TrEMBL record:
Signal peptide: none annotated. PROSITE patterns: YRDC. Coiled coil: none annotated. InterPro entries: DHBP_synth_RibB-like_a/b_dom, Sua5-like_dom. This is YrdC-like domain-containing protein. GO terms for molecular function: double-stranded RNA binding. Pfam families: Sua5_yciO_yrdC. Residues 10-211 form the YrdC-like domain. Gene3D superfamilies: DHBP synthase.
Amino acid sequence: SMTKHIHWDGNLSQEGFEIVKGEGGVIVCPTKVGYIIMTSDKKGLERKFEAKKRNRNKPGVVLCGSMEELRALAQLTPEIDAFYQKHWDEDILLGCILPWKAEAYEKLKAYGDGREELMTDIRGTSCFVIKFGVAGEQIAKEMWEKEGRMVYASSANNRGKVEGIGERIESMVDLVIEADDYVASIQPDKTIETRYEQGVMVSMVDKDGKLIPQQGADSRSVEPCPVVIRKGLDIDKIMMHLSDQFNSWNYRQGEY
Protein backbone atom coordinates (compact mmCIF):
# COMPACT_ATOMS: atom_id res chain seq x y z
CA SER A 1 0.00 0.00 0.00
CA MET A 2 2.88 2.39 0.76
CA THR A 3 5.05 2.55 -2.39
CA LYS A 4 8.68 3.61 -2.91
CA HIS A 5 9.37 6.28 -5.60
CA ILE A 6 12.78 6.97 -7.18
CA HIS A 7 14.16 9.25 -9.94
CA TRP A 8 15.82 7.76 -13.07
CA ASP A 9 19.31 9.20 -13.66
CA GLY A 10 19.99 7.89 -17.17
CA ASN A 11 21.83 4.71 -16.12
CA LEU A 12 20.41 1.18 -15.71
CA SER A 13 18.09 0.92 -12.66
CA GLN A 14 19.60 -1.81 -10.45
CA GLU A 15 16.70 -1.56 -8.00
CA GLY A 16 14.10 -1.98 -10.79
CA PHE A 17 16.01 -4.92 -12.28
CA GLU A 18 16.21 -6.87 -8.97
CA ILE A 19 12.46 -6.37 -8.39
CA VAL A 20 11.39 -7.67 -11.81
CA LYS A 21 13.89 -10.53 -11.58
CA GLY A 22 12.14 -11.63 -8.33
CA GLU A 23 9.05 -13.90 -8.43
CA GLY A 24 5.89 -11.85 -9.11
CA GLY A 25 7.69 -8.51 -9.35
CA VAL A 26 5.87 -5.50 -10.86
CA ILE A 27 7.13 -1.95 -11.52
CA VAL A 28 6.05 1.33 -13.16
CA CYS A 29 8.48 2.80 -15.73
CA PRO A 30 8.78 5.87 -18.07
CA THR A 31 8.67 5.62 -21.87
CA LYS A 32 8.94 7.99 -24.87
CA VAL A 33 5.14 8.54 -24.78
CA GLY A 34 4.34 8.15 -21.03
CA TYR A 35 4.26 5.34 -18.40
CA ILE A 36 4.05 1.51 -18.53
CA ILE A 37 3.56 -1.34 -16.06
CA MET A 38 6.31 -4.01 -16.44
CA THR A 39 6.53 -7.68 -15.32
CA SER A 40 8.23 -10.98 -16.25
CA ASP A 41 5.97 -13.86 -15.11
CA LYS A 42 2.38 -15.15 -14.81
CA LYS A 43 2.02 -14.08 -11.14
CA GLY A 44 3.07 -10.53 -12.10
CA LEU A 45 0.72 -10.52 -15.11
CA GLU A 46 -2.29 -11.41 -12.96
CA ARG A 47 -1.48 -8.43 -10.72
CA LYS A 48 -1.32 -6.14 -13.79
CA PHE A 49 -4.67 -7.10 -15.30
CA GLU A 50 -6.38 -6.82 -11.87
CA ALA A 51 -4.84 -3.39 -11.11
CA LYS A 52 -5.98 -1.87 -14.43
CA LYS A 53 -9.17 -3.93 -14.66
CA ARG A 54 -8.10 -4.83 -18.20
CA ASN A 55 -9.92 -7.26 -20.50
CA ARG A 56 -8.25 -10.69 -20.35
CA ASN A 57 -8.55 -11.11 -24.13
CA LYS A 58 -6.35 -8.04 -24.61
CA PRO A 59 -2.73 -9.32 -24.27
CA GLY A 60 0.37 -7.54 -22.94
CA VAL A 61 3.18 -6.80 -25.44
CA VAL A 62 6.74 -8.21 -25.73
CA LEU A 63 9.55 -5.68 -24.99
CA CYS A 64 12.69 -6.43 -27.12
CA GLY A 65 16.12 -5.29 -25.87
CA SER A 66 17.94 -6.17 -29.11
CA MET A 67 17.54 -7.39 -32.66
CA GLU A 68 18.97 -10.74 -31.58
CA GLU A 69 16.10 -11.40 -29.15
CA LEU A 70 13.58 -10.47 -31.87
CA ARG A 71 15.09 -12.91 -34.39
CA ALA A 72 15.21 -15.71 -31.81
CA LEU A 73 11.46 -15.40 -31.02
CA ALA A 74 9.39 -14.19 -34.00
CA GLN A 75 8.86 -15.50 -37.55
CA LEU A 76 10.22 -13.07 -40.17
CA THR A 77 10.70 -12.47 -43.92
CA PRO A 78 13.70 -10.61 -45.36
CA GLU A 79 11.54 -7.50 -46.04
CA ILE A 80 10.12 -7.47 -42.48
CA ASP A 81 13.58 -8.02 -40.97
CA ALA A 82 14.92 -5.10 -43.09
CA PHE A 83 11.91 -2.92 -42.10
CA TYR A 84 12.77 -3.35 -38.37
CA GLN A 85 16.55 -2.78 -38.83
CA LYS A 86 15.95 0.69 -40.26
CA HIS A 87 13.78 1.59 -37.28
CA TRP A 88 16.55 0.21 -34.98
CA ASP A 89 19.32 2.18 -36.76
CA GLU A 90 17.36 5.43 -36.59
CA ASP A 91 15.93 4.92 -33.09
CA ILE A 92 12.20 5.04 -33.87
CA LEU A 93 9.57 3.46 -31.61
CA LEU A 94 7.80 0.62 -33.48
CA GLY A 95 5.42 -2.29 -32.73
CA CYS A 96 4.43 -5.17 -35.08
CA ILE A 97 2.00 -8.08 -34.69
CA LEU A 98 3.87 -11.32 -35.55
CA PRO A 99 3.59 -15.16 -35.08
CA TRP A 100 6.01 -17.11 -32.81
CA LYS A 101 8.62 -19.53 -34.14
CA ALA A 102 7.44 -23.09 -33.39
CA GLU A 103 10.49 -23.91 -31.28
CA ALA A 104 10.30 -20.61 -29.38
CA TYR A 105 6.66 -21.20 -28.51
CA GLU A 106 7.56 -24.63 -27.08
CA LYS A 107 10.18 -23.03 -24.84
CA LEU A 108 7.62 -20.34 -23.92
CA LYS A 109 5.25 -23.07 -22.68
CA ALA A 110 8.08 -24.95 -20.97
CA TYR A 111 7.96 -22.43 -18.09
CA GLY A 112 4.76 -24.18 -17.08
CA ASP A 113 3.23 -21.13 -15.39
CA GLY A 114 0.72 -20.71 -18.24
CA ARG A 115 1.86 -17.19 -19.26
CA GLU A 116 0.87 -17.75 -22.94
CA GLU A 117 -2.65 -17.04 -21.76
CA LEU A 118 -1.86 -13.38 -20.95
CA MET A 119 0.78 -12.32 -23.53
CA THR A 120 -0.31 -14.07 -26.74
CA ASP A 121 -3.76 -14.07 -28.31
CA ILE A 122 -5.76 -17.15 -29.36
CA ARG A 123 -4.13 -17.22 -32.83
CA GLY A 124 -0.69 -17.38 -31.21
CA THR A 125 0.53 -13.89 -32.14
CA SER A 126 2.11 -11.10 -30.04
CA CYS A 127 3.09 -7.43 -30.47
CA PHE A 128 6.92 -7.11 -30.51
CA VAL A 129 8.25 -3.58 -29.72
CA ILE A 130 11.67 -1.87 -30.09
CA LYS A 131 13.17 1.57 -29.18
CA PHE A 132 10.34 2.36 -26.77
CA GLY A 133 12.35 4.39 -24.24
CA VAL A 134 15.88 4.09 -22.75
CA ALA A 135 15.02 3.36 -19.09
CA GLY A 136 13.02 0.25 -20.01
CA GLU A 137 15.40 -0.67 -22.86
CA GLN A 138 18.25 -0.97 -20.33
CA ILE A 139 16.27 -3.34 -18.08
CA ALA A 140 15.02 -5.56 -20.95
CA LYS A 141 18.58 -5.94 -22.26
CA GLU A 142 20.04 -7.04 -18.89
CA MET A 143 17.23 -9.55 -18.33
CA TRP A 144 17.76 -11.09 -21.78
CA GLU A 145 21.57 -11.17 -21.96
CA LYS A 146 22.30 -12.04 -18.33
CA GLU A 147 19.39 -14.24 -17.27
CA GLY A 148 17.83 -15.39 -20.52
CA ARG A 149 14.53 -13.86 -19.36
CA MET A 150 11.77 -11.83 -21.13
CA VAL A 151 9.85 -8.67 -20.03
CA TYR A 152 6.15 -7.84 -20.71
CA ALA A 153 4.09 -4.65 -20.49
CA SER A 154 0.89 -2.62 -20.70
CA SER A 155 0.35 1.14 -20.34
CA ALA A 156 0.02 2.71 -16.87
CA ASN A 157 -3.51 4.05 -17.37
CA ASN A 158 -2.06 9.82 -17.73
CA ARG A 159 -1.28 12.70 -20.12
CA GLY A 160 2.44 11.95 -19.79
CA LYS A 161 2.76 12.58 -16.04
CA VAL A 162 3.48 10.16 -13.18
CA GLU A 163 0.71 11.66 -10.99
CA GLY A 164 -1.68 10.63 -13.77
CA ILE A 165 -1.27 6.88 -13.17
CA GLY A 166 -3.92 6.91 -10.43
CA GLU A 167 -4.35 5.70 -6.85
CA ARG A 168 -5.28 2.05 -7.57
CA ILE A 169 -2.29 1.30 -9.81
CA GLU A 170 0.15 3.19 -7.55
CA SER A 171 -0.64 1.21 -4.38
CA MET A 172 -0.68 -2.20 -6.08
CA VAL A 173 2.84 -1.89 -7.57
CA ASP A 174 6.25 -2.56 -5.91
CA LEU A 175 8.18 0.49 -7.27
CA VAL A 176 7.57 3.65 -9.34
CA ILE A 177 10.38 5.13 -11.44
CA GLU A 178 9.84 8.86 -12.21
CA ALA A 179 11.12 11.01 -15.15
CA ASP A 180 8.45 13.58 -16.18
CA ASP A 181 11.13 15.81 -17.79
CA TYR A 182 12.30 12.93 -20.05
CA VAL A 183 8.73 12.44 -21.39
CA ALA A 184 8.29 16.17 -22.03
CA SER A 185 11.59 16.52 -23.96
CA ILE A 186 10.47 13.96 -26.55
CA GLN A 187 7.86 16.31 -28.12
CA PRO A 188 9.01 19.91 -27.43
CA ASP A 189 7.05 21.22 -30.41
CA LYS A 190 3.69 19.97 -29.10
CA THR A 191 1.24 20.90 -26.36
CA ILE A 192 -0.63 18.64 -23.95
CA GLU A 193 -3.58 18.63 -26.38
CA THR A 194 -1.49 17.97 -29.52
CA ARG A 195 1.15 15.48 -28.31
CA TYR A 196 0.89 11.77 -29.20
CA GLU A 197 0.01 9.48 -26.26
CA GLN A 198 0.84 6.10 -27.83
CA GLY A 199 3.06 4.39 -30.40
CA VAL A 200 2.26 3.13 -33.91
CA MET A 201 1.11 -0.49 -34.44
CA VAL A 202 1.51 -2.42 -37.74
CA SER A 203 -0.12 -5.81 -38.45
CA MET A 204 2.21 -8.22 -40.30
CA VAL A 205 -0.15 -11.21 -40.26
CA ASP A 206 -3.33 -12.19 -42.12
CA LYS A 207 -6.73 -12.70 -40.47
CA ASP A 208 -5.84 -16.23 -39.33
CA GLY A 209 -2.55 -15.20 -37.73
CA LYS A 210 -0.35 -16.48 -40.56
CA LEU A 211 2.66 -14.39 -41.75
CA ILE A 212 2.08 -12.16 -44.84
CA PRO A 213 3.90 -13.20 -48.08
CA GLN A 214 7.18 -11.82 -49.44
CA GLN A 215 6.48 -9.20 -52.11
CA GLY A 216 9.68 -8.44 -54.04
CA ALA A 217 10.99 -5.08 -55.28
CA ASP A 218 9.44 -5.63 -58.74
CA SER A 219 5.93 -6.79 -57.66
CA ARG A 220 2.58 -4.89 -57.73
CA SER A 221 -0.66 -5.07 -55.71
CA VAL A 222 0.32 -8.08 -53.54
CA GLU A 223 -2.17 -9.26 -50.87
CA PRO A 224 -2.36 -10.04 -47.98
CA CYS A 225 -0.13 -7.09 -46.99
CA PRO A 226 1.10 -4.95 -44.03
CA VAL A 227 -1.65 -2.87 -42.29
CA VAL A 228 -1.31 0.22 -40.07
CA ILE A 229 -3.90 -0.32 -37.28
CA ARG A 230 -3.04 2.45 -34.76
CA LYS A 231 -1.82 6.02 -35.32
CA GLY A 232 0.96 7.41 -33.08
CA LEU A 233 4.41 8.92 -32.43
CA ASP A 234 6.39 9.52 -35.68
CA ILE A 235 3.70 8.11 -37.99
CA ASP A 236 5.06 10.32 -40.82
CA LYS A 237 8.54 8.68 -40.79
CA ILE A 238 7.05 5.19 -40.54
CA MET A 239 4.78 5.53 -43.61
CA MET A 240 7.76 6.87 -45.60
CA HIS A 241 9.66 3.69 -44.62
CA LEU A 242 6.70 1.48 -45.49
CA SER A 243 6.59 2.94 -49.01
CA ASP A 244 10.35 2.43 -49.51
CA GLN A 245 10.14 -1.25 -48.53
CA PHE A 246 6.77 -2.51 -49.87
CA ASN A 247 4.93 -1.65 -53.12
CA SER A 248 1.70 -2.67 -51.43
CA TRP A 249 0.23 -1.71 -47.98
CA ASN A 250 -3.02 -0.56 -46.24
CA TYR A 251 -3.96 2.19 -43.76
CA ARG A 252 -6.78 1.28 -41.29
CA GLN A 253 -6.97 3.60 -38.22
CA GLY A 254 -8.82 2.23 -35.19
CA GLU A 255 -8.61 -1.49 -35.82
CA TYR A 256 -6.78 -1.80 -32.46
